[model samples]
Target: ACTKNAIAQTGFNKDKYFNGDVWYVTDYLNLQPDNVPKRYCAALAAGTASGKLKEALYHYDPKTQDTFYDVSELQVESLGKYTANFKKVDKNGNVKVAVTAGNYYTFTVMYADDSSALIHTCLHKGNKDLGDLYAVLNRNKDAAAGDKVKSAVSAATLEFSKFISTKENNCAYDNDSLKSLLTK
Candidate 1:
């Protein structure tokens, strides 16, 4: 099979596949000695130190995108999944769910001081529908109100808003700061 066609055949994880990250997908065109060839699968090689999911979502290749190695060589084989038909499986492995890939993608960074601050950011710009909902949820809540909500959905939204807000507004909490914080 053609190399490009082969590359196209490799099943990258759309749900979690961040571009620029080293990935090894099953070779859709590998030739086996027994001729009982199976489709090539895909898995992460290494998180390209610079690719970070943010760059991938933006459709831009980070400086490290090409740093792929064989899964076994990279010691990442344990993370492999035969997901060539991955979408055919469910959270419980009962049934597959339908998923679609978006042709165009964008990425944004955010930050907030409180849960409401996060909600305020979402409310501050973009998608009116989402903003309205954020306004309602964050009405009087503070930066950390999401945790107080405790409901799975509310807690997640709260955390997400808090996370993005932290990223966006406060330079002290931005990626570089976070890296230092994490390293500490």
Candidate 2:
């Protein structure tokens, strides 16, 4: 099934998923943490997929409470490959079929310092294994360091896409996986 159709069955609110207050990174799935920057918090917003590259930014909810992040502004270069269908296993050891989209994409973030960095990460599609990605020319590390981080994020994203694209589990739309995601 298509990603949009599956997302509809799973009750995926694009506005809420993208515009929500909190976005956490994945811990498992064998991601290399030592290579990433400290306190690597990330989030994603919708994009126009064309033109002058319009998108949104993710910010903190408040000056003190940093557990959650808020989204605002516009900074995106290009974005594509919006959705996919996959089988996900939840915390209860239940395997289910679900659809996820508007999360897996690639875009560039322009900074006010006359510099920019690339970021690649999936949004709220429920792949705790896939996690988030970030890159900054002068934020956590040096500009060259950003290159390595960007490469890692891209490889991880590709792995995630491969895992879901396979139909070995015979999972489709509105199955247990979809219900698990919906219930959450």
Candidate 3:
């Protein structure tokens, strides 16, 4: 918990654990709060992550017609860049998925912040703006598509976990607690 302590002492609000606007698998899986297209979007984004299943793809809008392999790609494409903010699972059973693009827009892919999820996929922007993303995901003909999505999403989750485990990618909090957190 040294990292946690450092986060607390330094008041590191940028960390995803403290800040909302990122995405997470659990929340998207559960679709907490009101179920909306964005929740589906988040799930779809992860579903498109790179894998062997070429037919299994994200239900994206045809208007976009963009080449995005996964949620990370979608985030990076939406914003100029995509950066992962360290996630924190609070004692209260809340999981915070942190993500931000400097001073630009931010969104949480989890239950904490749904605005980003909606806007990123253009769900809130408008029906026309929402584009064909939802349709592509929901009406996909490939039955294996769902399986591919699930497998890819799990891999994507592991990728994030691996990212946070790395010292350079992790929060990199410069405090006395840094060593303790890293060691643990």
Among these predicted structures, which one has the highest lDDT?
Answer: 2
lDDT of 1 by residue, 102-174 (tens): 2111111111222211111111111221121121123221223344333432433333332222112221112
Write down the RMSD of all candidates, one decimal each: 21.6, 17.8, 19.5
Candidate 2 lDDT, tens digit per residue, 33-143? 443333333322332322322233322222243432121223322232132223333433244433344333332231112122233333343343333433332222112
Task: Write down the RMSD of candidate 1 (Cα, Å).
Answer: 21.6
Please list the C-alpha lDDT of all candidates, in the order they appear.
0.20, 0.29, 0.22
TM-score winner, 2 or 3: 2
- Once fitted onto the true fold, the runs of candidate 1 whose alpha carbons sit more than 4 angstroms away are 1-95, 102-110, 113-184
Structural similarity to truth (TM-score) of each candidate: 0.17, 0.22, 0.19
Judged by whole-model lDDT over C-alpha atoms, candidate 3 comes out at 0.22
lDDT of 2: 0.29
Misplaced by over 4 Å in model 3 are 1-30, 37-122, 125-142, 158-184
Q: Pick out the ten consecutive residues of candidate 3 with the lowest summed lDDT.
A: 1-10
lDDT of 3 by residue, 1-184 (tens): 0010000112212232222112222222211212222322211222222321111112222334322211222233222212222222222213333223331212322111212221112222212222211111212212122443333334333222221111121111112222112211
Candidate 1 CA-lDDT value: 0.20
Angstrom error of the Cα, residue 184, model 2: value is 32
lDDT of 2 at 15: 39
